[PDB]
Amino acid sequence: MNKRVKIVATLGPAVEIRGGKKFGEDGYWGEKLDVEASAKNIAKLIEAGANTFRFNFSHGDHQEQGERMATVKLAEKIAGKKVGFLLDTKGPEIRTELFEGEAKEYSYKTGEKIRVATKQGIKSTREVIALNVAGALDIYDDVEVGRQVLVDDGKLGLRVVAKDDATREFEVEVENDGIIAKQKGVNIPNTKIPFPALAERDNDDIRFGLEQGINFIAISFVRTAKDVNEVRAICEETGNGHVQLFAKIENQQGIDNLDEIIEAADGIMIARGDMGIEVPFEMVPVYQKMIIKKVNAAGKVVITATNMLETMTEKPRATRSEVSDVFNAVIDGTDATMLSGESANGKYPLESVTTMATIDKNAQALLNEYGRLDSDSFERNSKTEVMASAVKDATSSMDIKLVVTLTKTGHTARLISKYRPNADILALTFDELTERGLMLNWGVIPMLTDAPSSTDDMFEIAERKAVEAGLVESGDDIVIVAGVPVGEAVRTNTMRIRTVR
Amino acid sequence: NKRVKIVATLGPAVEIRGGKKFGEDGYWGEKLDVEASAKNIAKLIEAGANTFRFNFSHGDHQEQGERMATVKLAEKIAGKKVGFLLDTKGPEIRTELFEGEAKEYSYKTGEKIRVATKQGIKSTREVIALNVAGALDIYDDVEVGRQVLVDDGKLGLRVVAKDDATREFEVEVENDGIIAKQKGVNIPNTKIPFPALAERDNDDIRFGLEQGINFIAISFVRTAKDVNEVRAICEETGNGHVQLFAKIENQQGIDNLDEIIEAADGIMIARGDMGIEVPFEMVPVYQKMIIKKVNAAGKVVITATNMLETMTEKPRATRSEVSDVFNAVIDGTDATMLSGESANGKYPLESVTTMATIDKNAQALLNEYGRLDSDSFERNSKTEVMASAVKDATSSMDIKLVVTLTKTGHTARLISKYRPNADILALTFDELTERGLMLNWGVIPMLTDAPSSTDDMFEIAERKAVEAGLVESGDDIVIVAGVPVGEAVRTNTMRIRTVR
Amino acid sequence: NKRVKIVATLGPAVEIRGGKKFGEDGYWGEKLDVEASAKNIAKLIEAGANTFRFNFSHGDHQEQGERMATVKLAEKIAGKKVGFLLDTKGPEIRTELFEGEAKEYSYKTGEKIRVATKQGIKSTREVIALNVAGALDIYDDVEVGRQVLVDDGKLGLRVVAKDDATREFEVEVENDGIIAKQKGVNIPNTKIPFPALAERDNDDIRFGLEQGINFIAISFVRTAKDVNEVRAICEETGNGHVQLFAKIENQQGIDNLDEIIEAADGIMIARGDMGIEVPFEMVPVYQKMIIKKVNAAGKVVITATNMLETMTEKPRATRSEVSDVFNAVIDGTDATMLSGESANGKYPLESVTTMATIDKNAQALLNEYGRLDSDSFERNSKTEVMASAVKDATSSMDIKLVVTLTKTGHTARLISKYRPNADILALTFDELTERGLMLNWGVIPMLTDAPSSTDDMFEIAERKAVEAGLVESGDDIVIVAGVPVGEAVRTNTMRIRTVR
Amino acid sequence: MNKRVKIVATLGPAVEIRGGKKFGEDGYWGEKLDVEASAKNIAKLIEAGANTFRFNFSHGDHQEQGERMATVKLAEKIAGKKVGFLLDTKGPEIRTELFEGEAKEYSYKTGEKIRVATKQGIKSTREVIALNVAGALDIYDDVEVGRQVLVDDGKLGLRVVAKDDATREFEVEVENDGIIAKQKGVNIPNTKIPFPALAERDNDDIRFGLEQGINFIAISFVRTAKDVNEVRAICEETGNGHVQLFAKIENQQGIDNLDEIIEAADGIMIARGDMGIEVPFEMVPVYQKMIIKKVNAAGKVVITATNMLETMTEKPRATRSEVSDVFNAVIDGTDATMLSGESANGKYPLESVTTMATIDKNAQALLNEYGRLDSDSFERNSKTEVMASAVKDATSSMDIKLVVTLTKTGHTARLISKYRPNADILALTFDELTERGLMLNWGVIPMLTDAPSSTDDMFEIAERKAVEAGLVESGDDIVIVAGVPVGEAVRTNTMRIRTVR
């Protein structure tokens, strides 16, 4: 059984050795990164089922990210397996300012009335809370009375009862008991704070990633198609047109514009943590299911992310709720599941990938019976779409061990993936950009091949590579799909059902 | 293109003797004109006849041999090949001659008369004698309460008692009617043990095989044995290519239909005799059931007899006849047949043209009203998966044509069975396979050189389709085959090709 | 129980005059023997005739009136009620008498002759004159290239030129044939401005309404206005219960089918005239399409003319005719019709019996082969939900009978439209609603006293069904109604009951 | 919007007042339970959506248990809504024995070799752990080499490496660093230890509960139909045949015998806690989905229980994973969701019930598009199936506000509930036992009424009670379904679609 659901693992210090020291050891940050020893740790994550590594530019500097990318390239060589490289942008942020007198935090009681300062370069007082806004942006004009200001992952709520134009301050009433600590995340739901579509930090981070060599960009806090289009303009301008963009839907404006965002993007990353703060908690499961169904309808890639196996950061076993949550992401029809802190900063990065691989493989067995996505609903206009449907019907009607597609661009692999056939998909391609770019599509095993000289040669190569890969053995039935004639840019128009010899 | 195939029975109706047309006096006086007759037969081929039926029920071997030769010339004039089908005489019961050379007698309802079972004797007014094929004694096979029907079921005699001394049936005339000499007799629901293959029929088949035929229609099939005995002769004479259609005409054949379909290559629904042998209201029931069951087995079904009966004497068919041909197509028939309308009628060409027009009109309603259902077939096999995919492709896109390169014709029969909304061009490498596909629904058989590889095979499919005028630049076709094309393998490859 | 209804046309074939039968000498001189004629008509009722058609194309009001009176006696003898349907004459064109009192002339293909439009002149071999209804001048309504068809479409005349000086058409004979005096004329694809309702049809309808009828079949309906003018007379005279069947006989009626179906209560598919007025191969196409659309509208369709035509002179139908009646049932027709077979033939009782047998046998195949599909209807209202539920019960379980108590017949018509796999007993409170349901598919109309509560309604439904002999102890029935049944409300209640 | 998914809340000190002392107050346990004060707290749980309370008879003497039941009866009057009374049996257990010398516990290192004794009535030593087995069974022949012995809710693993026939001891190896304390739960996965059906005290506990008036029994650790049949025999012999039995599926043998258990029982409680210990963690979601489908197919009640909102035991909000877990149990097709520690011993018992109610109501809105149960799948060849299917089709085809049934036994209500119509089900019954017995059926609102005199009266009562309950108003469409005549135990045979006046 091959794992059809792809795993995105976030890389961090958890797998990194410095001067023989492991993360958390005293003096760890005082040593140079040990590249070959760290690469051996990352190869184990590849072997356990990580299909793509996420480089989170929210933390660290470019030199750390570049070294990490170099460590993965060595790990691919050690493991003898390739992975996708995904860049995650920092995006806009609002943080709690510093407190006067060096005070770490203040505890507040419901009904207590305090103020929120929009002026930048000011410290916070227990009475008045100061906001560090990205770009030192003035948000006073963009928050309406009745809005909510939430502090530290939505734990504390301040209702905006009044605005004082005299000091550009928010007059709020505490809604629930809690603590306001310094440098804490702030979210103001259902606001349209005018952070620019593409900030200079995000521009630097994307151009750096593009130069290092990446296959995917996950764009943080996408609110409209423009946030996707500004990034696409950079990929096309720099001659990186192959790079695929995943919009991170984390707030109500993003949900409101989901159809236009899906059209612009190559996929969606569902960020459940931030989405849970920005929208009513009971709607997250609704938005997750709806987003997965719509992205699959568009033949695009969806990643379910954040809070998947979070307890495995500190514990070797996940909770029943966490196992259920990952399992149900697969049944919902996700292409990929993601690990953040569990793989980047946790005590059990290898166990976290292994656990997610085990849940994903188990869930894939129920996809035939309990799977939510339904291929019959699709509109098959293009001949290529018609062929993908026939492949799906073959895998439904007969015991098909593998679907083999010869694809110069990967387009046919993506169309077959979209139908969720009851078989693994071997995508034979001729360049590394296409190979790595298919690493997050459901069920796709990308592999490099030699070019066929004829249609008969192509059928022979398809069976030979499947056997050499260990995917099938004599008596197994496979479906082979290709554009004929084979040399040219002929779209996939041929299907053959073959018994492996 | 007409997807439903037409079988036309040949007879004197199209033959020119000297310079005289059928029905002119002294016609039988004149010698047969081969070239003039072939020109007329060619007109039937252009009109849409796909196979000619040689009825060994009438005429002799010399007569059958001369007509088969005339069709071969007609193929050349027309420039289109047709199938050759032999229809056997098979088992019959006829009324005997009357003593004193009387022609016939009339009877009234309620009269008590007798039917003799003794063979080689003459009838009398009071005692009708039967000429049973093989001079069988049928006295122990007919029970009291059975019915004896004379002259195409017109006059009924109810068996009320049996007389062991004379071995006679005591009968009651059920209706006013006439019993004439040499008229057909039917005893429905009886198992008269006619041999599986009689010597006369064995003889006729061996003669037709010698002349060269593609199909045999076996009259009055009652069990698989009847089909299997003819299969043995075809195999022994090196004629394994011949396809056998069992003619279902009576209750015993209907009761053993599953075993007969398994033994045969197809079924000819003989509505004339079936309407006598079973209740008249059951004929539409058996026609629909047989067409469905034959299509389920992937074999050929012919709907035959009285399709455009009135066109034997009149230039236009009845509303009922048009409805009957049309509904045969809707039921899912591979082929419709003409007997007297083409064999000895006043309008043989008009009958083929009328049948072709109704058949072509009916094929346009198959998508919405068609009674066959391709989704009903088992889909856990490579073959069923490919055919289903091909049918799905023709439904989802506007595919004009399905093309196959087939050594044996299996891919063509497989696609035909699924009844795609497209013509099927079957490119084959021998004349035996080519004429053998002439009665398969939607199949246009064509001869070509075997291809050297899968790419060559794809190129030949597109080239022949364009050459035949079946498709043009920018048209989409589906090419289906068992690769490799030289080997004999299950259909396993499909390609949707945009004709450039 | 026969689900498909039979319309039998009454005529002299069942009527005995002073002990004489139709055709014998001085038959028309004798007064009609009412009791002897009523006994003959009662046998047609017992054989399965559900409605009698009185064709006002032939005879006078006195002959029609005495015939309608005779049926009332036949209902008493049979112990069974029947519907009364009036068929209008409508617009006609007939060839005129010839000079020298010649009866007819024979013509050959390619001959050139003329057709006069002037009214009140005799024909010559060279110049055919017409009797157009109302003495309408049709010269401006017929374009060159149109066809003039004579005698049930047997002889075709192509209009090749128009002479403005004599207002004559120059025509070319298209086929060998005869023009006889007083023969029907059809000019396909023309819009001759016959009134929407001619005075003669107004007189015939008002006469029938006075006598007491349940249905009117309106001849040659071209637009909804033809239906609405008849509806106005029915409402004006207090005969708003009377249901109108539009006869679709020509291209204009087919072109306006959707508006005609909305105006009428049903459609009579007049295959005879339709086969002349449209291409012969399209008649089956229009027949299936019309049956589907009328069923979709929840209205009644009658398939008419030439169903068992040969039974006019012969005691058995052809295989094609049996197939034709059988497939009308499979297409989804509510009713089949007999014209000359029952009105003027030698075998009126046999024709009704043969049609009943075919119809009964065909209904057993509706589940597997029926073209109508109740799943196609939209299901967003209570009435559609209840009918779909009744149908599902008859599909899922072995339901013998659906029983409704209905003031207006709405629940019966709704269930009939869904074609359940069960007979429908419709218990109603008045003879007009009862007779008005006699052409709906599967409905057995019966009179009953209105119930005093829902519990009383349920016991009456079971008690009448058991006493009618429709179901027996342990059979399951479905009871459907608009509770409370005394009011005219939407079908809203269903019960599955095991009969005691 | 009426909550269709039912909530079972476990009773505990968290809502209980003792001598004016709230839980976690010094001298709390010394005080008597306060009936009136506690009833006011429990009433709030009822208003928030609790449909049944779960009682455990092991904590406190019967006098006190009687008091606790009296409080809930008082709370019903206060909230103005009736609730079901569920008793949870202790069931058979293995517990670690006392240690010699009063040692409370010992700690062990991975790879240590110790022993597990099978002899009964003896003390543990550090190197020889003794067991207290229900029924005083000898388990030596029931546990093969290679089996695992788990101590304290699966926290410490002991692998059986060998067996000693002279002492009848298991030689085991410590799998992970941990503690073995006295009186701790022991699990031996994939074994068929033939435990008695009930704990020694369960027979007395059940008999007391039946005297007090309970509607449901949840039978712990059911492995065969035999375990359900023993409890049924107690119910029938005391004249309490109305009591519904829920089998708790906690182990592999229970899953293997699921068909026979569902047949013997009135429902299944999926005990995810014990199941998580006894079967591989990744299979729990598989078994949860299969159990929900099979119980629904049998027209019986399923309860999904354990760790639904566990973090709300100590924190005011649930994790994203917990919200997802509760939501997906509804989509899977569960009749009810259950709270244990969250309502029994937690800091936020009321908030736990409100949060579960919010998630369940939100999830029921997605059942039409994403629900995994498939009513079309059911056999449709009987009158009862035909009628239920017609009601479901009516609610699918039309805007049906309510399905109303008048039922003597509750059969029509359980039949409609099984089909999961897109409407609430108002079940009018004639006795309190039938009314309380329907409290856990999906979407059923049980209500008391007088028997009708005729079919027309039954139709009038159905509409009038619905209007009175405030469930519908004039112009709303309702479906009325019943077995006429409703005075008898007849099969559902009548349906009417009625516009409310």
Author numbering:
A (entry chain D), D (entry chain B): 21 to 521
B (entry chain C): 22 to 521
C (entry chain A): 2 to 501
Quote the authors verbatim:
Pyruvate kinase (PYK) is the last enzyme in this pathway that catalyzes the production of pyruvate from phosphoenolpyruvate (PEP) and plays a crucial role in controlling carbon flux; however, while S. pneumoniae PYK (SpPYK) is indispensable for growth, surprisingly little is known about its functional properties. The overall structure of SpPYK, which consists of four protomers with three domains, shares the structural organization of archetypal PYKs. PYKs require divalent cations for activity, and they are either K+-dependent or K+-independent depending on the active site residue being a Glu or Lys, respectively. This residue is Glu93 in SpPYK, and we found that both Mg2+ and K+ are necessary for the proper function of SpPYK. In contrast, only a modest activation effect was observed upon G6P addition, and the kinetic profile remained sigmoidal. These results demonstrate that FBP is the primary allosteric activator of SpPYK.
We successfully obtained SpPYK crystal structures in all ligand combinations including apo-SpPYK (2.0 Å resolution) and PEP/FBP-bound SpPYK (1.8 Å resolution), which provide insight into its conformational movement upon ligand binding. In the ligand-free structure, the side chains of Arg380-Ser397 and Thr455-Asp456 form hydrogen bonds that stabilize the interaction between the two protomers. In the apo-state, Ser321 forms a hydrogen bond with the universally conserved Asp325, and our result indicates that this interaction could be crucial in maintaining the inactive state of the enzyme in the absence of FBP as it was not present in any of the FBP-bound structures. Ser321 forms a hydrogen bond with Asp325 in the absence of FBP in SpPYK, whereas this aspartate interacts with the conserved arginine in the apo-state of M. tuberculosis PYK.
